[PDB]
């Protein structure tokens, strides 16, 4: 089955593993994982993080035919489990100095969920994209500005985390996937660029 192919030691995740808009797995509510994790579930998380590392690496992205990304959910690999990986890099300064921290967020999250959020909404100015969606989709994807999430790591340790800005948006977008929600579900149906007063537009 799909998970068996993905977790083979020599197997690298690429675009051929990513299912496409229309595939029913994208619309399911993914199943919670139980702890302790199976070896498959642990390796799957590791492969998913590796895929994001590769997508952000100039050489490996070219070798594998990948395009940059910051998040991946297991349903996108045809695996209906509540597993996501997020990897959001910090950026060099104007002088070309690497940041203090390589990443502002780097986690493989098991059973993640939003436990509370701000009343205020936010949206990326440039909209959102998706590896499973081979269409141009304009518009503000309206999300919570700030969230508090809970999730478990591969060890079963529970974490509780507050997020805002871009990382809030990235997380979620990935949580949506494990609930069978697609980004364009959160775009205004009649005017993609409608702005309800108070919306935080993120640059
Ligand atoms: Zn493959
Ligand atoms: Zn391991
Ligand atoms: Zn590598
Ligand atoms: Zn709680
Ligand atoms: Zn609420
Ligand atoms: Zn996505
Ligand atoms: Zn919500
Ligand atoms: Zn629509």
Residue numbers in the entry: 2 to 204
Give sentences copied directly from the paper behind this entry.
PDFs are ubiquitous essential metalloenzymes which co-translationally remove the formyl group carried by the initiator methionine in bacteria, mitochondria and chloroplast. Here, we present and characterize a PDF enzyme issued from the bacterium Streptococcus agalactiae (SaPDF) which behaves as an excellent structural platform to describe PDF-inhibitor interactions. Like most other PDFs, SaPDF behaves as a monomer and its crystal structure reveals a classical PDF fold. In addition, SaPDF contains the typical insertions of type 2 PDFs12, including an eight-amino acids loop folded as an α-helix (insertion 2) and a long loop connecting strands β2 and β3 usually referred as the CD-loop (insertion 3).
The apo-protein crystallized in two different crystallization conditions, which gave highly similar structures (root mean square deviation between all Cα is 0.307 Å). According to this measure, both free SaPDF crystallized in a slightly open conformation (δap measured between C131, H178 and V71 is respectively 48.0° and 47.5°). Like other PDFs10, the core of SaPDF is composed of two α-helices, three 310-helices and eight β-strands organized in two β-sheets. The structure is organized into two sub-domains around the active site, called N- and C-terminal sub-domains.
